Amino acid sequence: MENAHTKTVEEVLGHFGVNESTGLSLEQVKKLKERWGSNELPAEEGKTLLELVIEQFEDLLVRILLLAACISFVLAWFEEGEETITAFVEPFVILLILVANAIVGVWQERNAENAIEALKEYEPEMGKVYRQDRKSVQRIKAKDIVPGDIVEIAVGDKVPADIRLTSIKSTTLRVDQSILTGESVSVIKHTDPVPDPRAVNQDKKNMLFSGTNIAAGKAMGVVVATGVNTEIGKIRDEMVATEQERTPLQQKLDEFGEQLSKVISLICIAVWIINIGHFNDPVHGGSWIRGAIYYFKIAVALAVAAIPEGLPAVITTCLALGTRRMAKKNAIVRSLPSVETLGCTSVICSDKTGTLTTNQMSVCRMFILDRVEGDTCSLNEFTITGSTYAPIGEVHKDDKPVNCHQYDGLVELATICALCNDSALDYNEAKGVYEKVGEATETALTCLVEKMNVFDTELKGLSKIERANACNSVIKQLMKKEFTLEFSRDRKSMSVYCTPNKPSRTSMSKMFVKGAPEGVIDRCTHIRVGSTKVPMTSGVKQKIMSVIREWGSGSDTLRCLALATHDNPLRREEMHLEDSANFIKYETNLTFVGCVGMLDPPRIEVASSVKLCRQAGIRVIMITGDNKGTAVAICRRIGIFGQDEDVTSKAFTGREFDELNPSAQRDACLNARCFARVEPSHKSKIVEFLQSFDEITAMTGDGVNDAPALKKAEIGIAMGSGTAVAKTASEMVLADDNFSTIVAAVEEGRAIYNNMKQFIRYLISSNVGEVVCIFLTAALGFPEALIPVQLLWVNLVTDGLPATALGFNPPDLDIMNKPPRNPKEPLISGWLFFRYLAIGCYVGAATVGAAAWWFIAADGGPRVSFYQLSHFLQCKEDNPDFEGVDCAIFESPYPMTMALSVLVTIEMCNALNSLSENQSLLRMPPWENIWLVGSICLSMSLHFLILYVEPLPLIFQITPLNVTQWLMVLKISLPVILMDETLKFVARNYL
Numbered sequence: 001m002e003n004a005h006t007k008t009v010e011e012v013l014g015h016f017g018v019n020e021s022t023g024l025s026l027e028q029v030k031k032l033k034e035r036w037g038s039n040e041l042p043a044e045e046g047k048t049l050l051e052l053v054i055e056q057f058e059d060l061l062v063r064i065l066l067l068a069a070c071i072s073f074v075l076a077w078f079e080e081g082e083e084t085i086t087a088f089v090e091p092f093v094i095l096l097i098l099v100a101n102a103i104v105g106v107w108q109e110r111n112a113e114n115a116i117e118a119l120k121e122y123e124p125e126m127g128k129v130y131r132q133d134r135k136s137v138q139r140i141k142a143k144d145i146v147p148g149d150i151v152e153i154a155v156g157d158k159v160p161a162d163i164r165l166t167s168i169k170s171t172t173l174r175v176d177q178s179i180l181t182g183e184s185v186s187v188i189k190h191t192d193p194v195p196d197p198r199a200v201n202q203d204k205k206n207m208l209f210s211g212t213n214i215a216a217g218k219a220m221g222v223v224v225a226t227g228v229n230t231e232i233g234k235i236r237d238e239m240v241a242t243e244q245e246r247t248p249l250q251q252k253l254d255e256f257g258e259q260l261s262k263v264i265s266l267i268c269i270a271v272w273i274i275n276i277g278h279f280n281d282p283v284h285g286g287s288w289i290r291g292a293i294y295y296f297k298i299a300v301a302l303a304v305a306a307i308p309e310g311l312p313a314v315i316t317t318c319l320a321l322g323t324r325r326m327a328k329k330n331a332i333v334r335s336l337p338s339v340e341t342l343g344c345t346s347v348i349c350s351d352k353t354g355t356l357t358t359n360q361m362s363v364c365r366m367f368i369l370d371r372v373e374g375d376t377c378s379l380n381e382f383t384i385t386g387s388t389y390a391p392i393g394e395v396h397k398d399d400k401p402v403n404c405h406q407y408d409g410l411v412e413l414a415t416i417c418a419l420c421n422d423s424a425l426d427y428n429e430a431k432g433v434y435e436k437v438g439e440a441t442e443t444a445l446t447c448l449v450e451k452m453n454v455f456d457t458e459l460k461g462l463s464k465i466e467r468a469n470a471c472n473s474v475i476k477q478l479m480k481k482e483f484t485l486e487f488s489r490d491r492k493s494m495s496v497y498c499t500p501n502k503p504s505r506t507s508m509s510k511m512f513v514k515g516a517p518e519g520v521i522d523r524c525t526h527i528r529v530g531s532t533k534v535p536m537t538s539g540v541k542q543k544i545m546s547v548i549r550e551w552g553s554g555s556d557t558l559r560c561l562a563l564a565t566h567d568n569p570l571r572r573e574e575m576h577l578e579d580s581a582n583f584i585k586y587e588t589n590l591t592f593v594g595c596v597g598m599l600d601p602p603r604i605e606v607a608s609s610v611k612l613c614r615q616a617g618i619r620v621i622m623i624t625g626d627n628k629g630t631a632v633a634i635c636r637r638i639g640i641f642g643q644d645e646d647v648t649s650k651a652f653t654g655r656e657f658d659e660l661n662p663s664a665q666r667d668a669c670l671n672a673r674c675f676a677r678v679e680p681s682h683k684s685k686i687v688e689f690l691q692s693f694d695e696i697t698a699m700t701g702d703g704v705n706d707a708p709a710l711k712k713a714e715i716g717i718a719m720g721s722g723t724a725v726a727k728t729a730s731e732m733v734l735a736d737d738n739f740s741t742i743v744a745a746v747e748e749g750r751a752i753y754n755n756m757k758q759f760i761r762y763l764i765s766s767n768v769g770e771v772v773c774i775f776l777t778a779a780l781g782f783p784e785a786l787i788p789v790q791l792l793w794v795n796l797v798t799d800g801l802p803a804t805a806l807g808f809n810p811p812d813l814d815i816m817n818k819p820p821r822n823p824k825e826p827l828i829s830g831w832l833f834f835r836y837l838a839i840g841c842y843v844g845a846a847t848v849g850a851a852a853w854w855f856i857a858a859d860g861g862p863r864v865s866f867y868q869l870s871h872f873l874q875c876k877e878d879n880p881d882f883e884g885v886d887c888a889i890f891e892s893p894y895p896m897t898m899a900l901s902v903l904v905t906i907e908m909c910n911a912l913n914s915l916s917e918n919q920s921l922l923r924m925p926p927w928e929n930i931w932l933v934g935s936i937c938l939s940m941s942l943h944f945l946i947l948y949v950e951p952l953p954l955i956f957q958i959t960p961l962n963v964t965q966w967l968m969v970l971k972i973s974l975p976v977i978l979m980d981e982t983l984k985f986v987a988r989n990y991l
């Protein structure tokens with residue numbers, strides 16, 4: 001469509017031929033599925049191989065390998081000599097690094113682009129559509145939405161597509177369009193046409209723009225634009241290009257890469273310097289003037305020896321596969337940096353309802369007025385059985401069954417519960433259970449109405465489906481809900497305006513109210529006794545609150561609601577419904593009717609999870625909107641407070657906290673474990689205090705008003721069943737809403753980072769050894785032990801596999817017995833630095849000695865001397881000192897094979913060392929991580945197949961050595977296990 005905002009609801013519906021009540025059909029969606037494509041934005045993969053090679057700016061070093069060979073081909077034509085077979089073999093070494101560097105960039109990075117998407121794949125963008133599959137609403141993927149679909153939306157929902165509104169269910173619908181327009185205030189919507197065709201998005205008030213979200217209200221509409229056709233889509237410019245802050249770990253790694261890259265010069269400076277064009281030198285020396293390649297090949301070998309080329313691939317694979325493991329544990333990670341932060345968590349601020357509790361609610365208690373004896377009063381108290389959402393149970397008074405219809409107060413009680421309610425029961429025929437639609441708290445009220453049956457409706461002979469709403473339906477037939485004043489967290493109550501269907505001759509409209517007992521009862525000027533109405537006296541008000549306090553603070557820890565009605569409400573025309581802040585003014589002069597209290601038991605594993613946090617040095621703070629008596633009692637039942645613990649300074653209502661002096665407010669955020677009857681402003685305020693203590697805080701939230709605190713906290717954690725707005729503002733989502741999942745995610749974050757410390761200290765260690773190996777060769781003068789072609793293959797394959805498997809090491813048994821990790825924790829400590837040198841110098845010497853062992857001493861090697869080797873460059877037929885000796889053997893695949901096979905076996909040994917940080921292998925056998933053992937074999941087999949498959953050993957300049965020569969490799973390799981084990985023992989039983 002063109003002008004959808006200008007067209008009428010009937011006109012836009014017509015343009016797609018769709019019914020508002022049944023939506024599109026099965027084939028009609030198929031028809032539009034081919035025309036419009038999905039609702040997805042075509043992020044360009046580009047599959048750009050040709051231009052990825054053009055980008056590839058990562059390795060500066062090996063790019064400098066490109067420059068000396070490329071322009072120098074001027075020499076290839078003018079080359080002085082007849083050499084043919086030995087001519088073009090060497091240039092393959094220089095060029096192959098270039099071709100392979102394309103693979104280093106491409107294969108590793110595209111897998112990272114897939115990682116970011118893999119996080120979204122576990123919880124796909126949803127949207128509520130109406131189609132001919134079901135008469136009720138249907139929840140499908142947002143991408144499966146096509147223009148013409150009927151979409152339903154409510155507070156917290158992300159608008160899945162550009163939508164022309166059709167009907168608004170609440171009194172008002174407000175949308176936060178801040179992502180699309182610059183408007184920071186929610187905009188009010190309607191269903192009328194906007195006749196101006198050139199109107200701006202700010203003025204197209206009958207439209208819902210994709211990417212925006214609903215601040216308040218509920219409504220329906222028809223989709224107009226999807227994909228690129230979306231108002232936001234066409235633009236796709238306001239975006240930055242993946243603008244993110246380096247993690248404290250990647251920074252340390254980037255920093256360690258930038259400091260040492262300058263240290264490359266320290267060794268490189270020492271080499272080039274030499275020429276030092278001799279300012280007093282003879283005229284004729286037989287100088288070898290073609291020597292402008294010696295310092296060049298070494299600098300390239302240094303770079304390949306100093307850079308952990310395999311590190312980013314191992315990191316990306318570790319996080320991604322770790323995240324999936326977390327997602328399996330119902331912790332869905334939206335941001336990869338959060339996994340590092342997660343391990344540092346020092347405070348968890350957890351919501352109570354549904355997170356610490358099970359959110360399976362049932363009303364087991366209720367009361368109404370009985371008699372008013374002057375200033376005192378008696379109550380009719382009742383119990384109610386059945387704890388599920390099944391509409392089956394009995395109502396008792398003094399354990400005797402009762403007819404609820406007899407009590408006029410119970411008839412009103414049930415009426416308020418039926419009417420001031422947005423929820424329903426639904427019988428799941430497949431699972432054979434009753435399920436809730438909407439809030440648990442409200443559905444409990446729904447389920448209560450069925451059990452009360454206050455009009456004595458015949459229920460025998462109704463299906464399971466009919467029994468779900470039957471008594472609720474009866475009350476709705478008598479009393480019509482015209483509009484509702486929605487629940488708000490500031491007044492903590494809700495009201496609905498209702499009128500009888502039968503013309504009454506008298507006003508007879510009412511407002512039925514339910515809410516937190518403290519506030520609602522404060523706004524009651526009268527009490528209902530049966531059908532009579534008498535003024536509320538403080539003696540009566542004290543009685544009501546005492547019982548309510550007793551229900552909430554008992555062992556059942558009842559979530560309580562007070563119920564009341566306004567007998568003389570204002571007319572709809574006299575109320576301003578655009579703002580919830582006005583609603584408390586309209587809910588006053590109320591008549592108190594009764595209270596209910598409902599089970600919401602603690603989760604079973606939460607107590608242990610709270611103990612685990614204590615062991616791990618993680619403070620736990622309960623945060624709730626519920627009553628302080630209820631909150632504290634749960635805190636005792638799950639162990640946040642002791643059974644007998646004095647909580648007078650450890651627990652606060654939002655108001656109490658607000659009334660504290662700043663000094664006392666600071667103490668509260670230091671010592672308090674329970675904040676009750678809070679408003680969304682308190683979470684942010686709490687986070688601000690926690691940050692001033694340098695705490696790293698995990699905060700939970702589900703609602704639109706939780707977004708600021710979720711963003712402000714170091715780890716925002718959104719409920720899986722909560723709003724989309726909250727999820728977008730958070731670093732993690734609890735798929736099951738469970739507090740325990742927070743703790744399990746923290747444990748995983750602690751474990752994943754520990755494994756990363758290993759394969760970082762492991763891959764860097766191999767580089768540290770490779771550097772002193774090249775240094776040993778330059779300083780001791782010896783021939784080339786290892787070539788950059790071997791280092792690259794080792795750092796990508798030989799070291800590549802065990803590093804990844806290192807990411808899968810089992811966590812320490814005490815991993816949750818240690819305090820939170822400081823985010824400023826050094827990646828390598830003083831003693832750990834000694835571990836670098838002790839290992840680095842080992843494999844450095846172990847590879848040079850191995851290459852010089854086959855040379856100087858062996859049965860089957862030529863047996864030169866030290867001076868013959870140190871000066872190998874002087875091996876010429878004219879040098880008096882090189883006399884009766886051959887120069888051909890100085891370049892041989894055998895000594896390099898000894899050095900490489902030693903380097904390989906060393907790393908396979910060092911990998912097993914890296915199974916744990918300080919734990920000896922005797923108690924941490926290599927099979928503790930099976931993937932690690934299988935990693936050694938797959939790489940070693942990759943090292944055998946690099947010899948006995950003819951094309952491989954030729955380009956690698958290696959030859960398979962003898963069985964006798966292979967044993968010498970083990971003689972110098974295995975002892976690295978002994979040295980490292982000694983270095984483990986020393987810290988353990990000494991440091």
Ligand SMILES: Nc1ncnc2c1ncn2[C@@H]1O[C@H](COP(=O)(O)OP(=O)(O)OP(=O)(O)O)[C@@H](O)[C@H]1O
Pocket residue numbers: 351352353354439441442487489492493494514515516517560561623624625626627678
């Ligand atoms: N649908 C509702 N209608 C009326 N009153 C409600 C409704 N839902 C909750 N309330 C009440 O007012 C209080 C405010 O609820 P709020 O959402 O802020 O916290 P909570 O519902 O107790 O959950 P949490 O433990 O996550 O804070 C509740 O404790 C309850 O007494």
Ligand SMILES: [K+]
Pocket residue numbers: 710711712713714715716729730731
């Ligand atoms: K945050």
